[PDB]
Amino acid sequence: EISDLTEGTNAYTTEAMSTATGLTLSPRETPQSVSVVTRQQIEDQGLTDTGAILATAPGISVTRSDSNRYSFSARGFTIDNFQFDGLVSPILSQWNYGSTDMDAAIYDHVEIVRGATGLMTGSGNPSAAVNFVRKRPLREFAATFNASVGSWDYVRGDADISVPITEDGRIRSRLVAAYSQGDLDTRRRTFYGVVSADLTPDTVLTTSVEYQHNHSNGPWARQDTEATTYFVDLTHRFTNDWKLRAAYSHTDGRYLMKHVFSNYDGNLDRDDIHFSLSAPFEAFGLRHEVALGWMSIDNHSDIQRYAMTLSPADDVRTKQTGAYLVGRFALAEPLHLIVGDRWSDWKTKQMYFGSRREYRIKNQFTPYAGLTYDINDTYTAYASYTEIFQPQNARDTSGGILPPIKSKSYELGLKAAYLEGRLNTSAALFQTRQDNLAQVIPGSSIPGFPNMQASRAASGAKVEGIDLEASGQILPDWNIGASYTHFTTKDASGNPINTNHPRSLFKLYTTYRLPGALHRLTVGGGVDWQSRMQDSYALVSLMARFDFNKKLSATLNVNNLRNVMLNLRAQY
């Protein structure tokens, strides 16, 4: 049904996600490779921030490019965007400001969509969309606390409290706070407070503030990151079930780095806006739905470097808008067609010492076509086509801006939802190509116009491979999340190209509550096995949980690559 909510289900799968199309669909009804990392998965595996949550997800690897730990990757490409409650924030280089380090306590789950995701994303790489969905207030009082200890003097505590503001819960609040310390010493403080008010039985106003401070030290380094996000959304359902949603976010970010002699001072400001109108309806005896929407992503970061890469000052301003229409149409009872259009505008204004990178791209069209066929109670087959574009700083022989890189993604597949959707499964074949990749024109330039060197649009890399997943409950007391991905990268004319990214990945994590006299004990563990086809890395891990009673448990995690974490959970 509805509810992307995974807290309290004890499940490794979900009923519903909305990241791929904006529409709230079950996994089996989404004609793309999609995953969840549920509340339960996060707690079983002791995942403490957004980066650690993403690292465990199907099809994701941490790729190293030049030293180690550099990027998150999927399908041959860097993940250059994150979403929080569906609002995109760029994350590479000066855009991060803690996005990959946000405390996990804030989030109910993360929704993943692999391949091109331009419909809802805008500009980006055909790797994955990654959407962290924040906890929302409950209608009644609830409290959860965690206290952890671990290797290298690691300590962590968090608190999660829902307080109704009126008795009925018409006005409701929720507060999350976390702290951690460790080592190379680092510490993290996080606060998140949210209030929702039913202005009518059909109108919800939500407001929230999110805050994180990350400090690290140890030539003595010293690095501080601080970020505050103000968020607001308004929802209204008309008596015809048409729905209006308006969302706004504003983020202030502060970065500060010392060395030995070297000083880095960065500021970030970011505004995100999203409006939508959706509408369910019947036509030709069948049920359909349509959504129209508009989003804006406006990013400003500035950096000053002082020393007594090399630039003394950068100011980068990137503004993007997209207008979309999405429909899901039943051509028959078992057979759905998803069609989307997005028109996007994108511009950048970048200032450096001695220069100025400034350009806009012509209005971009991004299509989406997905087809799903319910074979029986269990199985659904699907095929999809979609795109994502990536602006590039490359110019004509005339001096004009090149079209953006255009990623073109084809996928077919088979899904199964066993035991009423308790166990979800997926097997997909994917093919992506990049067209209009800037190619530096021989040794000929055209920098009488400005600067140095010109390009033409050429064909780029091709990726093809397979994407397999199984997540949910095999038997009562037995949870699993398992996935396998393999892909091949080639150039436009068809010979292999080397990449840093792993081409084969296998992941499995399983828990099992013991059957009888041992029923207070759950044991589990897993493997994260990536391979560049050359070498191999395997994270092997183990856990045990003891349920003292219904409201109090201890969890032990061991990870290898030892690393040992012990957690107590207490709830009201």
- Resolution in angstroms comes to 2.3
Q: In what order do the strands lie in the sheet with 107-114?
A: 34-37, 107-114, 128-134, 81-84, 87-90
| Residue 149, token pair as written in the block | 């200890």
* Of residues 20, 23, 32, the one with CA closest to residue 432: 32
Amino acid at 152: W
Distance of CA 456 to the CA centre of its chain: 33
* Of residues 352, 281, 286, the one with CA closest to residue 314: 352
- Give the single-character DSSP code of 95: G
Please report, in angstroms and rounded to a whole number, the separation of the first and last CA atoms in the chain: 28
Helix (H) or strand (E) holding 53: helix 50-55
| Residue 330, token pair as written in the block | 């039943």
* Of residues 274, 270, 271, 272, the one with CA closest to residue 246: 274
Instruction: Give the 3-state secondary structure of residue 51.
Output: helix
Buried b (16+ CB within 10 A) or exposed e, 58-83: bbbbbbeeeeeeebbbbbbbbbbbbb
Whole-angstrom distance, CA of residue 282 vs CA of residue 298? 38
Buried b (16+ CB within 10 A) or exposed e, 489-503: beebeeeeeebebbb
Q: What experimental approach yielded this model? A: X-ray
A 10 A CB-CB count for 331 gives 13
Domain ranges of the chain: 34-136, 137-572
Whole-angstrom distance, CA of residue 315 vs CA of residue 328? 42
Whole-angstrom distance, CA of residue 331 vs CA of residue 370? 13
A 10 A CB-CB count for 213 gives 17
Amino acid at 310: L
Whole-angstrom distance, CA of residue 387 vs CA of residue 340? 11
Could you give the angle at the alpha carbon of 159 between the alpha carbons of 155 and 161, nearest 5°? Answer: 175
* Of residues 445, 447, 464, 467, the one with CA closest to residue 456: 445
* Fold (CATH) for 137-572: Maltoporin; Chain A (2.40.170)
* Of residues 376, 374, 500, the one with CA closest to residue 76: 500
Instruction: Give the 3-state secondary structure of residue 6.
Output: coil
Residues in contact with 310: Cβ distance below 8 Å, sequence separation at least 6, in sequence order = none
* Of residues 520, 521, 539, the one with CA closest to residue 529: 539
| Residue 220, token pair as written in the block | 């003595």
In the block, tokens 């003394």 appear at 312
Whole-angstrom distance, CA of residue 482 vs CA of residue 57? 9
Whole-angstrom distance, CA of residue 34 vs CA of residue 113? 4
Whole-angstrom distance, CA of residue 40 vs CA of residue 108? 9
Hey, do 34-136 and 137-572 end up sharing a CATH topology, with the first three levels equal? no
Whole-angstrom distance, CA of residue 547 vs CA of residue 554? 7
CATH number of 34-136: 2.170.130.10
Amino acid at 378: T
Whole-angstrom distance, CA of residue 384 vs CA of residue 391? 24
Q: In what order do the strands lie in the sheet with 77-78?
A: 61-63, 71-74, 77-78
Helix (H) or strand (E) holding 291: strand 286-307
Whole-angstrom distance, CA of residue 134 vs CA of residue 232? 13
Could you give the angle at the alpha carbon of 208 between the alpha carbons of 182 and 316, nearest 5°? Answer: 75
Half-sphere exposure of 567 (CA within 13 A, CB side): 24
Bridge-based pairing state of the strands 81-84 and 128-134 = parallel
Bridge-based pairing state of the strands 128-134 and 537-549 = unpaired
| Residue 536, token pair as written in the block | 């191999």
Give bridge partners of residue 30 from the DSSP assignment. Answer: none
Query: Mind giving me the DSSP string for 358-411?
Result: EEEEEEEEEEEEEEEEE-SSSEEEEEEEEEEEE----B-SSSPBPPPEEEEEEE
| Residue 530, token pair as written in the block | 């990536």
